[PDB]
Amino acid sequence: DVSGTVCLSALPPEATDTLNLIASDGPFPYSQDGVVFQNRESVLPTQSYGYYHEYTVITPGARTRGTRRIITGEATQEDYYTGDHYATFSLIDQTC
């Protein structure tokens, strides 16, 4: 399962961006947003279909989309941040 949560302060300034785009339901800059993620990686504490979504967090000097990616749930307070391209997953603690 997830390696635990990740204090929002522990995340980059481009990580909050997505959380703001999920909270403000856009508008999103990157093309990565407004899509489901049926935990096809089976790495996330899923169970149901359409209970997940993708929202890659922008990144500076990111030649590409960057291995970074946010994966939100169907319930607020469930935004996994790989940071290694669907490799790892650490929820986001906005409180932290």
Side-chain angles (χ1 to χ4, degrees):
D1 49 49
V2 187
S3 284
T5 320
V6 85
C7 295
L8 221 214
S9 183
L11 279 195
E14 49 265 9
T16 232
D17 191 15
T18 291
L19 320 186
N20 231 325
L21 305 167
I22 283 128
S24 229
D25 209 39
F28 299 77
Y30 255 27
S31 276
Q32 234 137 52
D33 41 263
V35 298
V36 158
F37 180 72
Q38 190 253 333
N39 70 309
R40 43 266 220 82
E41 253 191 344
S42 181
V43 169
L44 289 271
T46 320
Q47 173 147 347
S48 52
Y49 178 36
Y51 186 81
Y52 273 64
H53 299 92
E54 297 125 291
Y55 300 108
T56 263
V57 289
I58 253 128
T59 277
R63 268 124 181 163
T64 72
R65 272 186 261 79
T67 56
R68 272 158 296 282
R69 179 95 129 207
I70 273 188
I71 314 302
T72 46
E74 202 108 78
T76 287
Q77 325 225 8
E78 274 221 281
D79 28 21
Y80 312 93
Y81 176 90
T82 157
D84 285 305
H85 189 260
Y86 284 137
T88 51
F89 294 95
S90 321
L91 282 192
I92 273 64
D93 241 331
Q94 312 114 64
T95 166
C96 195

mmCIF file with all atom_site columns, all heavy atoms in Angstrom, residues 4-5 11 23 44 47 51 55 60 65-66 80:
data_model
loop_
_atom_site.group_PDB
_atom_site.id
_atom_site.type_symbol
_atom_site.label_atom_id
_atom_site.label_alt_id
_atom_site.label_comp_id
_atom_site.label_asym_id
_atom_site.label_entity_id
_atom_site.label_seq_id
_atom_site.pdbx_PDB_ins_code
_atom_site.Cartn_x
_atom_site.Cartn_y
_atom_site.Cartn_z
_atom_site.occupancy
_atom_site.B_iso_or_equiv
_atom_site.pdbx_formal_charge
_atom_site.auth_seq_id
_atom_site.auth_comp_id
_atom_site.auth_asym_id
_atom_site.auth_atom_id
_atom_site.pdbx_PDB_model_num
ATOM 1  N N   . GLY A 1 4  ? 2.630   5.987  2.984   1.00 0.00 ? 4  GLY A N   1
ATOM 2  C CA  . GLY A 1 4  ? 2.145   6.984  3.946   1.00 0.00 ? 4  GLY A CA  1
ATOM 3  C C   . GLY A 1 4  ? 1.890   8.309  3.236   1.00 0.00 ? 4  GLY A C   1
ATOM 4  O O   . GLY A 1 4  ? 1.948   8.398  2.017   1.00 0.00 ? 4  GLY A O   1
ATOM 5  N N   . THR A 1 5  ? 1.433   9.271  4.000   1.00 0.00 ? 5  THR A N   1
ATOM 6  C CA  . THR A 1 5  ? 1.117   10.619 3.488   1.00 0.00 ? 5  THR A CA  1
ATOM 7  C C   . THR A 1 5  ? 2.383   11.461 3.364   1.00 0.00 ? 5  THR A C   1
ATOM 8  O O   . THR A 1 5  ? 3.489   11.025 3.660   1.00 0.00 ? 5  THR A O   1
ATOM 9  C CB  . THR A 1 5  ? 0.061   11.221 4.441   1.00 0.00 ? 5  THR A CB  1
ATOM 10 O OG1 . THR A 1 5  ? -0.880  10.198 4.815   1.00 0.00 ? 5  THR A OG1 1
ATOM 11 C CG2 . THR A 1 5  ? -0.781  12.300 3.772   1.00 0.00 ? 5  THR A CG2 1
ATOM 12 N N   . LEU A 1 11 ? 6.082   18.779 -0.101  1.00 0.00 ? 11 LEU A N   1
ATOM 13 C CA  . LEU A 1 11 ? 5.899   18.794 -1.548  1.00 0.00 ? 11 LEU A CA  1
ATOM 14 C C   . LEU A 1 11 ? 6.328   20.104 -2.225  1.00 0.00 ? 11 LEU A C   1
ATOM 15 O O   . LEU A 1 11 ? 6.451   21.125 -1.538  1.00 0.00 ? 11 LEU A O   1
ATOM 16 C CB  . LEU A 1 11 ? 4.448   18.470 -1.889  1.00 0.00 ? 11 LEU A CB  1
ATOM 17 C CG  . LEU A 1 11 ? 4.188   16.960 -1.863  1.00 0.00 ? 11 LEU A CG  1
ATOM 18 C CD1 . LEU A 1 11 ? 2.862   16.773 -2.567  1.00 0.00 ? 11 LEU A CD1 1
ATOM 19 C CD2 . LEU A 1 11 ? 5.204   16.139 -2.642  1.00 0.00 ? 11 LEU A CD2 1
ATOM 20 N N   . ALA A 1 23 ? -9.484  21.230 -6.138  1.00 0.00 ? 23 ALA A N   1
ATOM 21 C CA  . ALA A 1 23 ? -10.311 22.033 -5.226  1.00 0.00 ? 23 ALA A CA  1
ATOM 22 C C   . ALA A 1 23 ? -11.130 23.095 -5.966  1.00 0.00 ? 23 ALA A C   1
ATOM 23 O O   . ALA A 1 23 ? -12.341 23.184 -5.795  1.00 0.00 ? 23 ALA A O   1
ATOM 24 C CB  . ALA A 1 23 ? -9.432  22.699 -4.166  1.00 0.00 ? 23 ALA A CB  1
ATOM 25 N N   . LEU A 1 44 ? -2.395  1.155  -5.269  1.00 0.00 ? 44 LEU A N   1
ATOM 26 C CA  . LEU A 1 44 ? -3.138  2.156  -4.511  1.00 0.00 ? 44 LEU A CA  1
ATOM 27 C C   . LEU A 1 44 ? -4.246  1.420  -3.749  1.00 0.00 ? 44 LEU A C   1
ATOM 28 O O   . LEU A 1 44 ? -4.713  0.393  -4.241  1.00 0.00 ? 44 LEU A O   1
ATOM 29 C CB  . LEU A 1 44 ? -3.720  3.127  -5.538  1.00 0.00 ? 44 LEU A CB  1
ATOM 30 C CG  . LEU A 1 44 ? -2.743  4.075  -6.258  1.00 0.00 ? 44 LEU A CG  1
ATOM 31 C CD1 . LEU A 1 44 ? -2.552  5.359  -5.496  1.00 0.00 ? 44 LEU A CD1 1
ATOM 32 C CD2 . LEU A 1 44 ? -1.340  3.556  -6.453  1.00 0.00 ? 44 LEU A CD2 1
ATOM 33 N N   . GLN A 1 47 ? -10.364 -0.233 -4.704  1.00 0.00 ? 47 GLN A N   1
ATOM 34 C CA  . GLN A 1 47 ? -11.405 -1.249 -4.475  1.00 0.00 ? 47 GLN A CA  1
ATOM 35 C C   . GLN A 1 47 ? -12.514 -1.134 -5.538  1.00 0.00 ? 47 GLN A C   1
ATOM 36 O O   . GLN A 1 47 ? -13.112 -2.120 -5.953  1.00 0.00 ? 47 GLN A O   1
ATOM 37 C CB  . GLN A 1 47 ? -12.008 -1.066 -3.069  1.00 0.00 ? 47 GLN A CB  1
ATOM 38 C CG  . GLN A 1 47 ? -13.201 -1.973 -2.823  1.00 0.00 ? 47 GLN A CG  1
ATOM 39 C CD  . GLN A 1 47 ? -13.328 -2.444 -1.383  1.00 0.00 ? 47 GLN A CD  1
ATOM 40 O OE1 . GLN A 1 47 ? -12.470 -2.351 -0.521  1.00 0.00 ? 47 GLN A OE1 1
ATOM 41 N NE2 . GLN A 1 47 ? -14.461 -3.057 -1.159  1.00 0.00 ? 47 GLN A NE2 1
ATOM 42 N N   . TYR A 1 51 ? -13.070 5.457  -8.882  1.00 0.00 ? 51 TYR A N   1
ATOM 43 C CA  . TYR A 1 51 ? -12.757 5.999  -7.543  1.00 0.00 ? 51 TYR A CA  1
ATOM 44 C C   . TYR A 1 51 ? -11.392 6.718  -7.540  1.00 0.00 ? 51 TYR A C   1
ATOM 45 O O   . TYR A 1 51 ? -10.883 7.093  -6.493  1.00 0.00 ? 51 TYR A O   1
ATOM 46 C CB  . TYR A 1 51 ? -12.787 4.823  -6.562  1.00 0.00 ? 51 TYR A CB  1
ATOM 47 C CG  . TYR A 1 51 ? -12.629 5.159  -5.061  1.00 0.00 ? 51 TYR A CG  1
ATOM 48 C CD1 . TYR A 1 51 ? -13.735 5.617  -4.327  1.00 0.00 ? 51 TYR A CD1 1
ATOM 49 C CD2 . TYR A 1 51 ? -11.347 5.121  -4.485  1.00 0.00 ? 51 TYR A CD2 1
ATOM 50 C CE1 . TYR A 1 51 ? -13.544 6.122  -3.022  1.00 0.00 ? 51 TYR A CE1 1
ATOM 51 C CE2 . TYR A 1 51 ? -11.136 5.629  -3.189  1.00 0.00 ? 51 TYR A CE2 1
ATOM 52 C CZ  . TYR A 1 51 ? -12.242 6.132  -2.479  1.00 0.00 ? 51 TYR A CZ  1
ATOM 53 O OH  . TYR A 1 51 ? -12.042 6.691  -1.258  1.00 0.00 ? 51 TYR A OH  1
ATOM 54 N N   . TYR A 1 55 ? -3.828  13.680 -12.272 1.00 0.00 ? 55 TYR A N   1
ATOM 55 C CA  . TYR A 1 55 ? -3.633  15.142 -12.278 1.00 0.00 ? 55 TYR A CA  1
ATOM 56 C C   . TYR A 1 55 ? -2.157  15.494 -12.058 1.00 0.00 ? 55 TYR A C   1
ATOM 57 O O   . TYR A 1 55 ? -1.772  16.075 -11.030 1.00 0.00 ? 55 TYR A O   1
ATOM 58 C CB  . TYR A 1 55 ? -4.475  15.762 -11.164 1.00 0.00 ? 55 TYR A CB  1
ATOM 59 C CG  . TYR A 1 55 ? -5.978  15.557 -11.221 1.00 0.00 ? 55 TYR A CG  1
ATOM 60 C CD1 . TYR A 1 55 ? -6.589  14.685 -10.310 1.00 0.00 ? 55 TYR A CD1 1
ATOM 61 C CD2 . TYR A 1 55 ? -6.706  16.236 -12.209 1.00 0.00 ? 55 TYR A CD2 1
ATOM 62 C CE1 . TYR A 1 55 ? -7.975  14.485 -10.413 1.00 0.00 ? 55 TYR A CE1 1
ATOM 63 C CE2 . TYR A 1 55 ? -8.094  16.008 -12.321 1.00 0.00 ? 55 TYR A CE2 1
ATOM 64 C CZ  . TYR A 1 55 ? -8.714  15.139 -11.419 1.00 0.00 ? 55 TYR A CZ  1
ATOM 65 O OH  . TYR A 1 55 ? -10.027 14.861 -11.562 1.00 0.00 ? 55 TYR A OH  1
ATOM 66 N N   . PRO A 1 60 ? 9.175   22.589 -12.624 1.00 0.00 ? 60 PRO A N   1
ATOM 67 C CA  . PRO A 1 60 ? 10.160  23.466 -13.282 1.00 0.00 ? 60 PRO A CA  1
ATOM 68 C C   . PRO A 1 60 ? 11.329  22.618 -13.809 1.00 0.00 ? 60 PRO A C   1
ATOM 69 O O   . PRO A 1 60 ? 11.624  21.550 -13.294 1.00 0.00 ? 60 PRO A O   1
ATOM 70 C CB  . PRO A 1 60 ? 10.601  24.448 -12.204 1.00 0.00 ? 60 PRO A CB  1
ATOM 71 C CG  . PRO A 1 60 ? 10.406  23.709 -10.892 1.00 0.00 ? 60 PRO A CG  1
ATOM 72 C CD  . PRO A 1 60 ? 9.245   22.759 -11.153 1.00 0.00 ? 60 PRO A CD  1
ATOM 73 N N   . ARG A 1 65 ? 6.596   15.798 -18.948 1.00 0.00 ? 65 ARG A N   1
ATOM 74 C CA  . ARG A 1 65 ? 5.578   15.795 -17.889 1.00 0.00 ? 65 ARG A CA  1
ATOM 75 C C   . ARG A 1 65 ? 6.126   15.521 -16.481 1.00 0.00 ? 65 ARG A C   1
ATOM 76 O O   . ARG A 1 65 ? 5.469   15.845 -15.492 1.00 0.00 ? 65 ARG A O   1
ATOM 77 C CB  . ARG A 1 65 ? 4.465   14.798 -18.206 1.00 0.00 ? 65 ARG A CB  1
ATOM 78 C CG  . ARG A 1 65 ? 3.428   15.536 -19.034 1.00 0.00 ? 65 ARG A CG  1
ATOM 79 C CD  . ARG A 1 65 ? 2.192   14.682 -19.288 1.00 0.00 ? 65 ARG A CD  1
ATOM 80 N NE  . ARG A 1 65 ? 2.195   14.048 -20.609 1.00 0.00 ? 65 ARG A NE  1
ATOM 81 C CZ  . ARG A 1 65 ? 2.864   12.962 -21.007 1.00 0.00 ? 65 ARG A CZ  1
ATOM 82 N NH1 . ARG A 1 65 ? 3.603   12.228 -20.175 1.00 0.00 ? 65 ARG A NH1 1
ATOM 83 N NH2 . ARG A 1 65 ? 2.762   12.591 -22.274 1.00 0.00 ? 65 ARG A NH2 1
ATOM 84 N N   . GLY A 1 66 ? 7.363   15.032 -16.463 1.00 0.00 ? 66 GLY A N   1
ATOM 85 C CA  . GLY A 1 66 ? 8.075   14.676 -15.231 1.00 0.00 ? 66 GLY A CA  1
ATOM 86 C C   . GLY A 1 66 ? 7.386   13.452 -14.643 1.00 0.00 ? 66 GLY A C   1
ATOM 87 O O   . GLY A 1 66 ? 6.163   13.311 -14.653 1.00 0.00 ? 66 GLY A O   1
ATOM 88 N N   . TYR A 1 80 ? -2.475  10.851 -3.971  1.00 0.00 ? 80 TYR A N   1
ATOM 89 C CA  . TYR A 1 80 ? -1.186  10.150 -3.986  1.00 0.00 ? 80 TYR A CA  1
ATOM 90 C C   . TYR A 1 80 ? -0.209  10.858 -4.915  1.00 0.00 ? 80 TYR A C   1
ATOM 91 O O   . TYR A 1 80 ? -0.562  11.252 -6.023  1.00 0.00 ? 80 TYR A O   1
ATOM 92 C CB  . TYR A 1 80 ? -1.416  8.733  -4.523  1.00 0.00 ? 80 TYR A CB  1
ATOM 93 C CG  . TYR A 1 80 ? -2.603  8.039  -3.854  1.00 0.00 ? 80 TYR A CG  1
ATOM 94 C CD1 . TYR A 1 80 ? -3.884  8.120  -4.439  1.00 0.00 ? 80 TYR A CD1 1
ATOM 95 C CD2 . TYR A 1 80 ? -2.378  7.303  -2.681  1.00 0.00 ? 80 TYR A CD2 1
ATOM 96 C CE1 . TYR A 1 80 ? -4.967  7.452  -3.858  1.00 0.00 ? 80 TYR A CE1 1
ATOM 97 C CE2 . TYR A 1 80 ? -3.464  6.621  -2.101  1.00 0.00 ? 80 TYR A CE2 1
ATOM 98 C CZ  . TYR A 1 80 ? -4.739  6.695  -2.705  1.00 0.00 ? 80 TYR A CZ  1
ATOM 99 O OH  . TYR A 1 80 ? -5.757  5.967  -2.190  1.00 0.00 ? 80 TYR A OH  1
#
